Each structure stands twice: as C-alpha cells, then as structure tokens.
Design a protein around this ligand. Structure first.
Ligand code: ATP
Ligand code: CA
Ligand code: CA
Lengths: 353, 139
C-alpha cells in the first residue's frame, strides 16, 4: 500500500509503510542523468535540498523519479505517498511538491509531514520536543498531540556537514591535506567512528593530557596514518559551542530551551519530561548525557528532565512515517486526487499541519 | 433558517461537535451556533483576543472560547489568503481534547470543533470552505 519518502539535506530514505526499515537509503545528489548513489561512485565526470529546503525542482523531480523507477521500482499512480518536509518549509514549496506529485506523477493520494513529528511518533509519543540534526540543518520542534508548534520552532544552520568541514579544518591545520571529496568520505568516516561528546568540555580538555584512551589512529587509503587527540570531542562540541565554528549562535541545549520558552506554560513540564533527539548527527556517544546536564542547568531545579535518544534515531523520521501511514486513521487524513481536482495546490495549507 | 443553515450544514457529516458563526465587528455577537454547547458562550473578551494586534502572547498564555482552555497551534488568522487559526483544547487530567479551526471572513468568524481523533486538517478544510461560501456572499 502506502509509500514513505524521507528527503534530506544529504540522505534520502524510501520504502513501504509497515516495513521496519527503509528499502533505499541513498545520497540526495544529482550530477543518462547521474543520481543518488550512482553519483558518488562515478564522481569525477548538485545538492537539490539545502538546509532542508528544496532549492532546485528539476533535480528534486529527478530524485523522485529515481526513487520510483530505479530505486523502489514501483508505479507512483498505484500508491498513496507520504512525503516528509522540514519544519517551517516555505509555503510556495509545499504547494509545488503537491503539484508535482498529483500532476507529474499522477499520485492517487498524498501527505506532507514535518520530519520531527514522525520521529516523536516513532517513540510512541504525541507530546514532546524534538531536536533533529541531519546534515544541513538543525531544528528544535515542540509538539502538542501530533501538531508541530511553528512559532516556537527554532532553526540552527549547523549540522553534519558543518562538522565534517570543521574536522577537516583542524586536521589540515595540523599538516595533513584533503580538498578532493573522494578524500572526505574519509574524514566523514573518521568523524563517525571516533567522535564523541564530552560531559564536561573544559574538564575533558584540561585532563586530556593524562590520556590513556583519548588517542586514536587512522590509516588513510594512501597507507599514511593519522594520530587523533582532543578532536574526537572538540568537533562535536561545536554543536554546544558554535563559536568554535565562527558563528554567533546558541548551542542545541540553549536552543531547545529557547523553544520550550516560546510555548504554552501548561505543557512546558511535558516538553521537559519528553525531549527527543533524532537524525544522523545526534548519533554521537555522550550527546544525551550532555543535553541532560545542560538543560538540568538551564531549567528550574525542580523540573523533571528526561532526554530520550532512541537507538534507531537516524531513521526515526522514516520509521515514524511508516507507522503513521499504515494506520487506518490515516486515510481520513490523506489528500486525494479529487480534493486535488477540487482545490488545487493550496490544499496543503489546510490539510497538512 | 438564515445563519443556522450553515451551522447545520457543517454538523452534517459526522465529524464535528460544535460550530458557530460570530460577527466580530463593533460588539462581537453570536449569529448562529450549535445549541447549548461551548461556542454559543464565546465572549467579546475572547473574540478581541482572536482579532487583536498582538499575535504572540496567546501562544504562551493560552486562550479560551466560551470558558474552555485552548492552545493556539497555528495562527494565520489576520493573514491574506489564509484566514485560519488552528487550535486544540486543553483538559485537566484525563479527559480528551479536540481540534478547532477559526476562519475569518469580512464580518465573521467561523468556528468548528472536531470530534475525538478527527484530524485538525479535515477540520481546517471544511471550516475554510464554508467561510469561503460566506466570503462571496459578501459577509
Ligand atoms: N555514527 C555517526 N556519528 C556521527 N555522525 C553521524 C553518524 N552517522 C551519520 N552521521 C551524520 O548524520 C548526517 C545524516 O543526516 P540525516 O540522516 O539526519 O538526514 P539529512 O539528509 O541530514 O536531513 P537534514 O540534514 O536535511 O535533516 C550525516 O552528516 C552523517 O555524517
Ligand atoms: Ca532530515
Ligand atoms: Ca494557562
């Protein structure tokens, strides 16, 4: 039955609903056409989505095309599709997505769900606030019974890529070199295997020297080895201290809090007892403990604070929408060709929120 | 008769539980409403809050229709081409809560409350249709 499609600043995930996991996870990139994984596997010879917003429709179109014909190899006009979007996605954009679905792909029914909302749902809640860091953008999204509260949503323009960038900046500041992106898959994988999150950054840095375990070694392809020290924790710390990256903004912990502060008083406790982390960039060991402590400091001393980080939290969004689009309740929720013939692209504004 | 045709039309499909048309101008008055339910009690106090300049304080303070406590989910009430405010009610303890949309015409608010588990999306759509019907009856 229903298709689920998670479109990301860097990674796309597609599958059928009722499935436990996707059935196509691929880069959100085009370059005969050159899409997805055939792009970063025959590299030498564009990122359509940027900070969660689509910037290029011809491309975006072609990814979807790829998703249906080459990836999920299925018929779009047979399937009600659930597409996901970023919190605060501009309006002309939710429209064009609707247009392109029913008219180009002639879909029978479709929905647009704020990514964060799926993740909160993936964990069996309907009230909570969700921190979702991917690759291009980080959002904090307070939620009340399945509805995002856009006025209290915050957007932090640093995620995964900014952190791969930062690791490659310091590692090069030491001597080593990378400027080809074939040699960046690399730094990415380093960031991923070895980086973690200090419970206390200054104390971590000041006691770093009595190392024992801090130190690690990574063999690059060209036989060469690199020694890695306080970088393991210093690069992900830019999430809490974005000054490390040159930017003047708040960290994820003060942002979450700032989002909680723009919400209705009568659910604030409920949001503090239900803060949910999701996205690839929240995968760091320690991040939960760290968020826990950071906000226990920001909150009244009596506020009960639970940070929740589900082990499948990198796929929380797609898992979330497979659960949702597979309930019966979901068809009294979807948008049909007829409703689309009656009212045009505008109907997203009314029906998806 | 008159304004009640609209209320009764909205109540017709199974999906909603209160509804009401309230002329917002001069002194706010209920033009029609579902008998002996919440919206019939809407006060000039709480309509002024739906129509006034400040569009943030209600997000933190909450608000009331009748005397019923409501969270503002999505406010575009005074915005051209949108005209809607979505909301959901608040219960103390265990009681269920329901979604609400209000849609503003030239002289009118259109207020619809869903039943339990009815998607704020359907509620938004309906309440917007009817109010479009009103809005090109020049009301
Ligand atoms: N084990 C890991 N440790 C640290 N970072 C990781 C790990 N695994 C993946 N990541 C990072 O998370 C990011 C993946 O982003 P995600 O899967 O959340 O979707 P997305 O494409 O980022 O959507 P968006 O960024 O627009 O929300 C990548 O930058 C990746 O490097
Ligand atoms: Ca994402
Ligand atoms: Ca209150």
């Amino acid at each position: 039955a229903a298709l689920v499609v998670d479109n990301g600043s860097g990674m796309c995930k597609a599958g059928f609903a009722g499935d436990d996991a996707p059935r196509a996870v691929f880069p959100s990139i085009v370059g005969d056409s050159y899409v997805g994984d055939e792009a970063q596997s025959k590299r030498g010879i564009k990122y359509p989505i940027e900070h969660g917003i689509v910037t290029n429709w011809d491309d975006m179109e072609k990814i979807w095309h790829h998703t249906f014909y080459n990836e999920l190899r299925v018929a779009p006009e047979e399937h009600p599709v659930l597409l996901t979007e970023a919190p605060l996605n501009p309006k002309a954009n939710r429209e064009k997505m609707t247009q392109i679905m029913f008219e180009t792909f002639n879909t029978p029914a479709m929905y647009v769900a704020i990514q964060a909302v799926l993740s909160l749902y993936a964990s069996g809640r309907t009230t909570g606030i969700v921190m979702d860091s991917g690759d291009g953008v980080t959002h904090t999204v307070p939620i009340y019974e399945g509805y995002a509260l856009p006025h209290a949503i915050l957007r932090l323009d640093l995620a995964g890529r900014d952190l791969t960038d930062y690791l490659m900046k310091i590692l090069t500041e030491r001597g080593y070199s990378f400027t080809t992106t074939a040699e960046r898959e690399i730094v990415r994988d380093i960031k991923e295997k070895l980086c973690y999150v200090a419970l206390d950054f200054e104390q971590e840095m000041a006691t770093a020297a009595s190392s024992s375990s801090l130190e690690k070694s990574y063999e690059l392809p060209d036989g060469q080895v690199i020694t890695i020290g306080n970088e393991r924790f210093r690069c992900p710390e830019a999430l809490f201290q974005p000054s490390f990256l040159g930017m003047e903004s708040c960290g994820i912990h003060e942002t979450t809090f700032n989002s909680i502060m723009k919400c209705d008083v009568d659910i604030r406790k409920d949001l503090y007892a239900n803060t949910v982390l999701s996205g690839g960039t929240t995968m760091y060991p320690g991040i939960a403990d760290r968020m826990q402590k950071e906000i226990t400091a920001l909150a009244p001393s009596t506020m009960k604070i639970k940070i929740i980080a589900p082990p499948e939290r990198k796929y929380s969004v797609w898992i979330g929408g497979s659960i949702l689009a597979s309930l019966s309740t979901f068809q009294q929720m979807w948008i049909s060709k007829q409703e689309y013939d009656e009212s045009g692209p505008s109907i997203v504004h009314r029906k998806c929120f | 008769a008159g304004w009640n045709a609209y209320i009764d039309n909205l109540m017709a499909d199974g999906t909603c539980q209160d509804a009401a048309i309230v002329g917002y101008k001069d002194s706010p008055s209920v033009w029609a409403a579902v008998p002996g339910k919440t919206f019939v009690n809407i006060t000039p106090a709480e309509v002024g809050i739906l129509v006034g300049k400040d569009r943030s304080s209600f997000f933190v303070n909450g608000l009331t229709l009748g005397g019923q406590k409501c969270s503002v989910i999505r406010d575009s009430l005074l915005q051209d081409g949108e005209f809607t405010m979505d909301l959901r009610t608040k219960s103390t303890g265990g009681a269920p809560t329901f979604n609400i949309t209000v849609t503003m015409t030239a002289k009118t608010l259109v207020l619809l409350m869903g039943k339990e588990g009815v998607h704020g999306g359907m509620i938004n759509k309906k309440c917007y249709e009817m109010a479009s019907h009103l809005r090109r009856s020049q009301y």
